[PDB]
Amino acid sequence: KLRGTSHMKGEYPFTITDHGINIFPLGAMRLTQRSSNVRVSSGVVRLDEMCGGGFFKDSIILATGATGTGKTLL
Amino acid sequence: PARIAIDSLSALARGVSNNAFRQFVIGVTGYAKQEEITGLFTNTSDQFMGAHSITDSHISTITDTIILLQYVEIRGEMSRAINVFKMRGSWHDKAIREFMISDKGPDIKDSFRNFERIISGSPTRITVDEKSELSRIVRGVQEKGPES
Amino acid sequence: EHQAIAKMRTMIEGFDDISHGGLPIGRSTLVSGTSGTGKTLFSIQFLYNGIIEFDEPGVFVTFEETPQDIIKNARSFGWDLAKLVDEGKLFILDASPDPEGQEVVGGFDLSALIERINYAIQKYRARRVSIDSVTSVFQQYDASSVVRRELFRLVARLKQIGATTVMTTERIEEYGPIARYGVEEFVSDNVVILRNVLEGERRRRTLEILKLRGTSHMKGEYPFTITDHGINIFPLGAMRLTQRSSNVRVSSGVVRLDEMCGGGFFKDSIILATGATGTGKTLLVSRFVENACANKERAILFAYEESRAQLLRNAYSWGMDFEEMERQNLLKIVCAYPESAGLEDHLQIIKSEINDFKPARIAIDSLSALARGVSNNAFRQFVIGVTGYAKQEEITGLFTNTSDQFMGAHSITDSHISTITDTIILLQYVEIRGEMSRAINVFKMRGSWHDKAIREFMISDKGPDIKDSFRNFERIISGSPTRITVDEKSELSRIVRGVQEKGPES
Amino acid sequence: RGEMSRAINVFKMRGSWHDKAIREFMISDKGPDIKDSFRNFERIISGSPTRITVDEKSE
Numbered sequence: 035k036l037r038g039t040s041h042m043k044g045e046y047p048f049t050i051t052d053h054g055i056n057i058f059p060l061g062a063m064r065l066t067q068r069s070s071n072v073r074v075s076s077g078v079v080r081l082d083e084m085c086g087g088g089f090f091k092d093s094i095i096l097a098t099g100a101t102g103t104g105k106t107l108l
Numbered sequence: 109p110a111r112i113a114i115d116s117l118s119a120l121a122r123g124v125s126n127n128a129f130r131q132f133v134i135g136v137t138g139y140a141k142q143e144e145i146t147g148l149f150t151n152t153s154d155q156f157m158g159a160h161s162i163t164d165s166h167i168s169t170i171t172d173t174i175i176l177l178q179y180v181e182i183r184g185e186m187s188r189a190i191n192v193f194k195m196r197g198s199w200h201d202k203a204i205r206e207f208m209i210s211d212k213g214p215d216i217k218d219s220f221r222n223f224e225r226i227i228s229g230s231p232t233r234i235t236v237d238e239k240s241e242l243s244r245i246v247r248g249v250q251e252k253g254p255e256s
Numbered sequence: 257e258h259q260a261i262a263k264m265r266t267m268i269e270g271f272d273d274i275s276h277g278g279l280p281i282g283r284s285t286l287v288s289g290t291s292g293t294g295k296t297l298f299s300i301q302f303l304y305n306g307i308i309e310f311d312e313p314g315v316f317v318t319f320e321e322t323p324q325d326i327i328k329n330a331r332s333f334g335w336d337l338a339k340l341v342d343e344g345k346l347f348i349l350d351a352s353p354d355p356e357g358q359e360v361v362g363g364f365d366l367s368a369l370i371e372r373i374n375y376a377i378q379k380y381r382a383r384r385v386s387i388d389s390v391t392s393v394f395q396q397y398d399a400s401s402v403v404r405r406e407l408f409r410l411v412a413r414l415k416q417i418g419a420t421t422v423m424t425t426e427r428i429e430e431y432g433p434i435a436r437y438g439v440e441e442f443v444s445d446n447v448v449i450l451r452n453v454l455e456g457e458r459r460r461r462t463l464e465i466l467k468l469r470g471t472s473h474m475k476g477e478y479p480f481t482i483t484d485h486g487i488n489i490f491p492l493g494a495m496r497l498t499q500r501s502s503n504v505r506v507s508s509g510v511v512r513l514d515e516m517c518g519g520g521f522f523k524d525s526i527i528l529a530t531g532a533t534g535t536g537k538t539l540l541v542s543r544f545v546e547n548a549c550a551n552k553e554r555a556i557l558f559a560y561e562e563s564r565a566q567l568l569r570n571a572y573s574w575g576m577d578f579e580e581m582e583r584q585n586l587l588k589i590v591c592a593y594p595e596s597a598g599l600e601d602h603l604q605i606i607k608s609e610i611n612d613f614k615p616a617r618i619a620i621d622s623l624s625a626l627a628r629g630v631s632n633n634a635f636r637q638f639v640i641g642v643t644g645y646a647k648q649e650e651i652t653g654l655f656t657n658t659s660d661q662f663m664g665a666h667s668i669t670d671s672h673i674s675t676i677t678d679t680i681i682l683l684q685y686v687e688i689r690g691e692m693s694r695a696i697n698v699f700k701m702r703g704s705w706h707d708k709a710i711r712e713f714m715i716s717d718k719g720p721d722i723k724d725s726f727r728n729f730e731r732i733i734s735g736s737p738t739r740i741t742v743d744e745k746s747e748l749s750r751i752v753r754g755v756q757e758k759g760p761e762s
Numbered sequence: 763r764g765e766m767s768r769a770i771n772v773f774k775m776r777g778s779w780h781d782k783a784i785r786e787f788m789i790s791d792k793g794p795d796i797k798d799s800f801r802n803f804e805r806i807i808s809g810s811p812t813r814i815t816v817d818e819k820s821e
């Protein structure tokens with residue numbers, strides 16, 4: 035509590051490092067990430083084709099599969 | 109970095125609670141996103157073949173592009189397939205392409221067009237008269253065109 | 257009103273519904289909770305609203321905070337108590353000890369106080385009284401029985417004076433005894449408990465009216481929020497099932513769909529679009545929002561999965577220019593991580609923004625994302641809240657749901673909101689010949705006829721193109737069907753040989 | 763065919779290439795004998811196959 039004003043509520047994880055206390059307000063991060071149309075290669079050309087010309091530079095790509103399928107190769 | 113890859117978010121989810129984990133993902137995910145860093149994340153599904161959900165931890169949502177790898181049992185053999193499951197701003201191919209691995213790396217071949225239930229890991233091969241109709245012996249309506 | 261007890265309105269949002277009218281007059285209501293739960297705020301708001309709405313003067317008794325502090329703090333909510341103290345409508349009676357004192361004085365002072373408060377009440381012609389933290393007074397060196405007697409004495413004298421009082425108390429455990437000495441509970445006429453529950457690192461505040469001798473009231477806990485406007489309570493169970501229902505139709509932003517829905521969605525309706533990740537629920541949302549602009553109506557897109565940037569890049573790639581909708585002041589985009597708050601907060605932000613923008617259409621992209629973490633019952637409660645608001649407000653609403661398993665999903669929703677919804681649009685992957693195609697289906701519609709087909713559809717830059725059903729297939733829902741043929745080649749335009757042109761001419 | 767046979771598979775190997783066949787195998791006093799894959803079967807993995815016995819192209 036802080037009588038008189040507002041503040042974020044709840045618990046926030048933090049780490050004590052060589053630079054002292056470091057807190058990550060993971061719920062304070064805003065949904066304002068920049069978004070372009072720029073592409074980039076996967077390291078696999080055919081893949082790039084399938085993806086309509088490569089992964090977007092601004093993107094989160096996820097490779098899922100069973101153990102041994104080759105995520106680590108990609 | 110311009111690119112970042114985490115080999116196995118699924119190995120980081122070991123032990124931890126799902127909510128602590130989801131929080132971590134959003135964490136490294138959004139940091140990368142706001143930083144203009146392209147990130148490639150790895151996830152090993154707990155069951156080979158028959159996997160009914162992209163991710164066990166339900167991160168699929170917090171992701172832009174999904175690349176899916178899966179075993180397909182073809183003739184007593186264990187082959188791989190790759191599929192661009194979804195891609196947010198693009199068009200991407202909808203084929204579940206077979207692919208081999210060599211020293212050269214990944215070679216993405218063709219789709220298993222003549223199969224049913226591929227998603228499942230154990231397809232049902234199925235030509236039993238290919239697309240040329242039971243009229244391969246084309247009736248004999250063509251017993252006139254040629255004469256003496 | 258058939259209630260045997262005359263009540264006084266607090267004007268605190270939601271409280272008067274919960275209390276079936278407000279606080280019983282002439283009696284005292286104990287309001288207790290742990291540190292930081294909003295006790296002081298409640299009691300201030302009680303006096304304040306009393307002065308500004310009924311010109312009912314108030315006496316505020318403080319045992320720990322300082323009169324300057326109580327005034328300083330109230331500025332947080334934009335309340336100028338100083339001005340009211342000035343006009344003689346509010347009187348803060350300083351009872352706080354001295355930062356330079358002795359020891360011993362909690363009962364003749366309890367008489368000195370009674371006599372004091374009666375002076376203030378009498379002098380200001382007060383009707384409302386708030387005593388902030390009576391607890392702290394016997395927190396001088398007392399035992400349960402001494403407390404019960406002293407409290408009783410005070411409450412009693414107050415009732416004689418005819419004053420309606422709010423007395424504040426502290427508790428150490430969120431679910432343990434009602435108040436410290438486990439004695440205040442029974443000495444007051446009404447008891448209100450403010451809670452600030454932890455549970456998973458998030459905090460949820462709830463208000464409960466435990467008792468009101470003489471009348472009924474709402475039972476249980478109710479979620480509330482402290483904002484720049486003070487306490488705000490949502491009696492989610494006080495919401496009535498009397499929403500207006502029209503037969504008017506509206507477009508989905510997709511013509512073919514509209515046909516499928518037997519003429520478009522109902523204005524008065526809650527629509528649900530579910531399907532596995534990647535199926536295109538987000539595309540439909542985009543197209544449903546855009547359509548209300550092309551018709552010069554206002555709409556809000558509350559996004560919980562994509563950035564405002566991304567939403568735009570993607571939208572533009574589907575035709576539709578979100579940029580313009582923004583400027584033209586027809587479309588408003590929100591955006592927020594479900595984690596950046598608790599459901600209660602979220603629910604209020606949505607309401608809030610619906611009031612400032614008066615939309616005609618609203619779209620929540622991914623309820624299923626708001627369900628991340630929360631308990632199903634807390635989630636369902638959130639859904640009934642946003643759903644019902646929309647409904648009684650004649651606002652058409654399109655909600656999204658991503659299903660946890662692509663293909664083979666056995667229930668429309670994993671959270672079982674099915675029923676809370678009027679129209680259900682269903683999207684799914686179909687494995688056709690080594691390829692992942694999509695299918696769309698109007699699963700249900702309450703007042704219309706809608707098409708029963710599971711049409712296949714493609715996504716282009718032009719957007720959604722809804723084609724035909726997979727007639728020659730069985731096990732469609734399974735996600736990987738079996739093709740069977742009584743035909744296929746049957747007409748539709750056989751007439752072989754040279755049927756086409758190529759790019760040159762035709 | 764109403765009998766419980768075995769099979770072995772090198773499911774994965776990190777640096778090598780390994781065989782992808784699910785090979786039938788028997789056990790004797792000599793130890794493990796690794797025979798052939800079940801080429802003419804479906805759903806092997808599942809444990810309860812279905813032999814294809816395709817009527818070829820049937821001409």
Ligand SMILES: Nc1ncnc2c1ncn2[C@@H]1O[C@H](COP(=O)(O)OP(=O)(O)OP(=O)(O)O)[C@@H](O)[C@H]1O
Nearest residue numbers: 101102103104105106107209210774775777778779
């Ligand atoms: N030189 C190679 N030639 C042919 N195939 C190879 C070669 N190296 C590895 N492989 C194949 O690729 C697989 C390795 O998978 P990879 O290292 O890409 O990661 P993964 O499948 O995503 O995850 P994990 O290895 O933890 O299961 C092996 O199981 C094997 O079948």
Ligand SMILES: Nc1ncnc2c1ncn2[C@@H]1O[C@H](COP(=O)(O)OP(=O)(O)OP(=O)(O)O)[C@@H](O)[C@H]1O
Nearest residue numbers: 035036039040292293294295296297332482483484
């Ligand atoms: N403008 C504001 N917007 C949102 N929250 C606010 C605002 N001002 C104050 N708050 C919150 O309200 C709380 C105030 O609590 P309050 O002063 O009402 O009494 P209390 O918690 O009941 O008792 P105590 O005297 O032990 O603190 C703060 O903890 C803070 O979180």
Ligand SMILES: Nc1ncnc2c1ncn2[C@@H]1O[C@H](COP(=O)(O)OP(=O)(O)OP(=O)(O)O)[C@@H](O)[C@H]1O
Nearest residue numbers: 194195197198199533534535536537538539715716
């Ligand atoms: N310009 C485009 N042209 C062709 N197809 C595209 C285009 N943009 C997106 N798509 C397709 O639409 C999909 C995007 O799904 P969409 O944004 O509609 O939301 P969703 O499936 O409901 O939810 P989520 O994206 O969170 O999984 C991609 O996976 C892709 O197949």
Ligand SMILES: [Mg+2]
Nearest residue numbers: 105106115116
């Ligand atoms: Mg690996």
Ligand SMILES: [Mg+2]
Nearest residue numbers: 538561562621
């Ligand atoms: Mg989306």
